[PDB]
């Protein structure tokens, strides 16, 4: 009875916290248009349907979003996959050349300024002997003045040759389902009120994650995942300021964004099999790209998040908002890609408020660069191809990214300011629910049995 | 609907309960442990790490007495210096996650003793068939 022997059970449900690689899998809707239409049409397997999202009881696991893995590898995965869709495309060695620029035909003012430069330049032909003269349109943010006449040059030519993206491939987001290989599991917190740090009381395992689309944006992340009922703020340590503050709200704010100008693309043959898609002529009115949001929905959704923010700071606290403090371009504004073209849109028009402790719309104007320098890589740029026609897109603003000003000296006002900074804080808004554990079977246990001879 | 009783037979469904759930589910976790251009290289090395990890465990059962029984039983007595507990309280009051930490301060003492006991039993069995 008390002469207990031991038995080793194999296959015992028990795990540890570990770190491993994952495996992407994309849905069948992205395979209906094929042959390098978007990236990772070949890099991912097609999905199995409807993973075994089953439940688990009497169970409690502490999570973390901040020292979590699988976001640290995804920022490497998307960059490493982003580089692969460029190397089959054209280099721009023959185009870093002297430019002869002038103003576009427009009623120009003395104080205010134009934003398009009509530039002509020498260029090679398919043949090597002959040359040609050809012209295009460019933005103010891509030419600098080399130093009567006034001749320009491109901006990135003193640091790196540039890669034109092929116009066949698209940059639109697609669903990506990560999956764990054999011998691992993915747990998912299913709690309602859960700030992302600390023990979740109702976990549920799953085979693969749900729909995770990759977007790119610094402030005001787009097409995100909605909150369940309330509006939730999340942070690592709110009394600290150097960490960002993720704000995820419930009712999505619809945002319209457009460029009303009408383009024309114009192919220039550089050599054999080379095609520089320059901008042709602009038909109609030279107008500025802009975005609209609704006034009342925004005044409401700030009223929700102030009610949520006052829980951590005392009820008697002045909360106000301000424009971004400064820096480079694509962290003061907010950026996004709208059907193959990148915007940079001033957002002073939203964060001009204060909040006491008791038909119209908002327009906000944008700028358009053509070359990007994403992830601030030392040997990289990307000339984007211009696209035809009047362009617009509709999106759901879903979360904010904030930063407190950490001032000393006896403050009741606790001002907040937007800021993008790292790209990973986009991603942590998506993978905060999951974690990866490693099954270790073959437990061992005393019981009352003895193996005979 | 699918009901409550289906997740009792799901993968890792018995993890939250006591051993009585885990006394019957052991085929499922054993089943899902195996079956699963530079991306092909990374997933290929993940797959071979998975099967190498499996085959280490089949080897480590092979050097013990139980080859593929999946419910072993063997011949070292349980030293009560570790447990210090009554019988059914580790059969009805505890979970396997809870059982993990109480035997995590010490390990491979048990794995050291099992190899020695099986090697000794094979020696005495070789003597028994040697006189036979």
């Amino acid at each position: 009875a008390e002469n207990l022997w031991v038995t080793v059970y194999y296959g015992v449900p028990v795990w540890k916290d570990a770190e491993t690689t994952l495996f992407c899998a994309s849905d069948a809707k992205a395979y209906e248009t094929e042959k390098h239409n978007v990236w990772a049409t070949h890099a991912c397997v097609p999905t199995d349907p409807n993973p075994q999202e089953i439940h688990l009881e009497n169970v409690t696991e502490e999570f973390n979003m901040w020292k979590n893995n699988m976001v640290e590898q995804m920022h490497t995965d998307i960059i490493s996959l982003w580089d692969q869709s460029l190397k089959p495309c054209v280099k721009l060695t023959p185009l870093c050349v002297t430019l002869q620029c002038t103003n576009v035909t427009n009623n120009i003012t003395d104080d205010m300024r134009g934003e398009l430069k009509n530039c002509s330049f020498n260029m090679t032909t398919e043949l090597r002997d002959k040359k040609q003269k050809v012209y295009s349109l460019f933005y103010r943010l891509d030419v600098v003045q080399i130093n009567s006449n006034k001749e320009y040059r491109l901006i990135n030519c003193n640091t790196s040759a540039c890669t034109q993206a092929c116009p066949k491939v698209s940059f639109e987001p697609i669903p990506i389902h990560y999956c764990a290989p054999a011998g691992f599991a993915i747990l998912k917190c299913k709690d309602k009120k859960f700030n992302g740090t600390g023990p979740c009381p109702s976990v549920s395992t799953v085979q693969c994650t749900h729909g995770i689309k990759p977007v790119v944006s610094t402030q005001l992340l787009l097409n995100g995942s909605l909150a369940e009922e309330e509006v939730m703020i999340r942070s690592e340590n709110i009394t600290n300021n150097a960490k960002n503050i993720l704000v995820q709200f419930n009712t999505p704010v619809q945002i319209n964004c457009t460029r009303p100008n009408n383009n024309t693309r114009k192919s220039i043959r550089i050599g054999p099999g080379q095609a520089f898609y320059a901008t042709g002529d602009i038909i109609g009115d030279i107008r500025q790209a802009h975005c609209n949001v609704s006034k009342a929905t925004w005044n409401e959704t700030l009223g929700k998040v102030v009610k949520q923010l006052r829980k951590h700071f005392g009820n008697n606290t002045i909360i106000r908002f301000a424009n971004s403090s400064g820096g480079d371009l694509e962290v003061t504004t907010h950026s996004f890609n709208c059907g193959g073209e990148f915007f940079y849109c001033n957002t002073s028009g939203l964060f001009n408020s204060t909040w006491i402790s008791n038909n119209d719309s908002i327009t906000l104007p944008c700028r358009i660069k053509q070359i990007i320098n994403m992830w601030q890589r030392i040997g990289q740029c990307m000339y984007a191809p211009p696209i035809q026609g009047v362009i617009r897109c509709v999106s759901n603003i879903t979360g904010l990214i904030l930063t407190r000003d950490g001032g000393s000296t006896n403050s009741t006002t606790e001002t907040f300011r937007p800021g993008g900074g790292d790209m990973r804080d986009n991603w942590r808004s998506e993978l905060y629910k999951y974690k990866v554990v490693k099954i270790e079977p073959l437990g061992v246990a005393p019981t009352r049995c003895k193996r005979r001879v | 609907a699918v009901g409550i009783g289906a997740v009792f037979l799901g993968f890792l469904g018995a993890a939250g309960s006591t051993m009585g759930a885990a006394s019957m589910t052991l085929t499922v976790q054993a089943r899902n442990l195996l079956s699963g251009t530079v991306w092909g290289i990374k997933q290929l090395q993940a797959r071979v790490l998975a099967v190498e990890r499996y085959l280490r465990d089949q080897q480590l059962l092979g050097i013990w007495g139980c080859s593929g029984k999946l419910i072993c039983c063997t011949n070292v007595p349980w030293n009560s210096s570790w447990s210090n507990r009554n019988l059914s309280e580790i059969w009805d009051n505890m979970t396997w996650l809870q059982w993990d930490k109480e035997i995590s301060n010490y390990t491979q003492i048990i794995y050291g003793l099992l190899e020695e006991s099986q090697n000794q039993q094979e020696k005495n069995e070789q003597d028994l068939l040697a006189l036979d």
Partner: antibody
Framework: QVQLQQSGAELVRPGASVTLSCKAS????????MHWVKQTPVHGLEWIGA????????AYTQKFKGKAMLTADKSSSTAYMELRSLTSEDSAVYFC???????????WGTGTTVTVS | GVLMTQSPLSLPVRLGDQASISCRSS???????????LEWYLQRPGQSPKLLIY???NRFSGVPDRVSGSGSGTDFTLKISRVEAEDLGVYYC?????????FGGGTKLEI
């Protein structure tokens, strides 16, 4: 015979603990599931959870885990509740019921009115 | 949670006309094999709630040929072609994909 003979109307003083009884009949308990659904005028139909009576495999929601208990006696062939910390919102109408695995609700009982007063 | 959002609640429906009671879920209710398990309830004041449909479309045994469910993903609408006095009262939605299941708020058919 296929019935859910429940308990009676219960005018319960607050702070008390209620043992409900769902005498199901028509089949064995070992075949199929047992379930409990509330009825409040605030929400409509609410939840308690579910029980499997062969082993005692229980599940609940987040709202009532740690509040209610589900026990099943295999010999007496009854069901049980063990409520704790009865509140004014808990005054409801309880419907015992049955599911099969991968099927629907066969039987629906009378509904025990448990008022907390 | 996976709480259902019923639209609309109150429908005073004259006798002989049609009725449409939609639910919208927070997530997809796709069960892990392909067969979603949706259910629609009855309720009269003084009767236990009982089932009309146990699928997207396939119905409880004994239910007449006037009630039909349809929809996809999140949006799932009940449609009654001819409304009688038995149809009056509270209807609900129900999920079967993964536990814990959530009822709605209750949609009353009136006259």
């Amino acid at each position: 015979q296929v019935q859910l003979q429940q308990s009676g109307a219960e005018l319960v003083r607050p702070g008390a603990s209620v043992t409900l009884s769902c005498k199901a009949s028509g089949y064995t308990f070992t075949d199929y599931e047992m379930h409990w659904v509330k009825q409040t005028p605030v929400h409509g139909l609410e939840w308690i959870g579910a029980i499997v009576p062969e082993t005692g495999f229980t599940a609940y929601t987040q709202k009532f885990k740690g509040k209610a208990m589900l026990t099943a006696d295999k010999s007496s062939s009854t069901a049980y509740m063990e409520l704790r910390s009865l509140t004014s919102e808990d005054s409801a109408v309880y419907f015992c019921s049955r599911l099969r695995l991968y099927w629907y609700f066969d039987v629906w009982g009378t509904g025990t009115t448990v008022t907390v007063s | 949670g996976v709480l259902m959002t019923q639209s609309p609640l109150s429908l005073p429906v004259r006798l002989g006309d049609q009725a449409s009671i939609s639910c919208r879920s927070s997530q997809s209710i796709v069960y892990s094999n392909g067969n979603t398990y949706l259910e629609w309830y009855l309720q009269r004041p003084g009767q236990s709630p009982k089932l009309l449909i146990y699928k997207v479309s396939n119905r409880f045994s004994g239910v007449p040929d006037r009630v039909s469910g349809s929809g996809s993903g999140t949006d799932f609408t009940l449609k009654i072609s001819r409304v009688e006095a038995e149809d009056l009262g509270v209807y609900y939605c129900f999920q079967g994909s993964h536990v814990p299941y959530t009822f709605g708020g209750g949609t009353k058919l009136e006259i």
